[PDB]
Write a protein that binds this ligand. Structure first.
Ligand SMILES: Cc1cc(CO)c2cccc(NC(=O)[C@H]3CC[C@@H](N)CC3)c2n1
Lengths: 39, 156
């Protein structure tokens, strides 16, 4: 039996840790909602 | 139960201790997470009960108490923030310019940030604070690192 607990407001915070890249990926989506890479 | 707007952890006690299985967004009296977090199970908010209202295994989305309410979309240009809520750890904004999932059916935003499975359902935001989608359905790339879709539902 699952329960929810609050964790924060939903707000944009100026000067947050900027990171990660922007990869363009060819992908497929099966009927079970699994993304896969098409190569 | 607590129906105040914002981000919530999704906990279970079925396993050892209390385990974070994912995250969701409360907005307009509706709770929004990804299907693989709850598998469509009812949820508890204090003594209140949240019942599933809509769900799709292929979108990997589910809503509680009402229809999907989040309809903002990535503009295709601007940086976003992932409001990561990791297990045992305080909520943390991470700013990023998303990549792209290219599929036969069109283009989806993708955020290249690796976090634990239990972070699934953390919201991804735009500069106006609107939720443009949820983190935690994606793919492990050539490198071995995780990339998530920006998964957004339809508001009817
Ligand atoms: C291997 C791995 C790793 C991480 C972190 O490194 C993950 C972080 C969040 C979510 C994951 N799961 C998914 O993206 C989905 C795959 C199929 C879908 N139908 C339901 C879940 C993660 N999977």
């Amino acid at each position: 039996d699952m329960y929810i607990e609050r964790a924060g407001d939903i707000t944009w915070e100026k000067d947050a840790e900027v990171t990660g890249n922007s990869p363009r990926l060819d992908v497929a989506l099966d009927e079970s909602g699994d993304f896969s890479l098409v190569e | 139960g607590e129906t105040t707007d914002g981000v919530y952890r999704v906990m279970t006690r079925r396993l050892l201790g209390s385990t974070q299985v994912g995250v969701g967004v409360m907005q307009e009296g509706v709770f929004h997470t990804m299907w693989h977090v709850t598998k469509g199970a009812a949820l508890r908010s204090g003594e209140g009960r949240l019942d599933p209202y809509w769900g799709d295994v292929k979108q990997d989305l589910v809503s509680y108490c009402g229809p999907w309410k989040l309809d903002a979309a990535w503009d295709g240009l601007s940086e976003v923030q992932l409001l990561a809520v990791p297990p045992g750890e305080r909520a943390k904004n991470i700013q990023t310019l998303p990549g792209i999932f290219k599929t036969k059916d069109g283009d989806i935003g993708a955020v290249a940030l690796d976090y634990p499975a239990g972070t699934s359902g953390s919201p991804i935001l735009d500069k106006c604070g609107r939720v443009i989608g949820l983190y935690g359905n994606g793919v492990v790339i050539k490198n071995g690192s995780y990339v998530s879709a920006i998964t957004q539902g339809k508001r009817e």
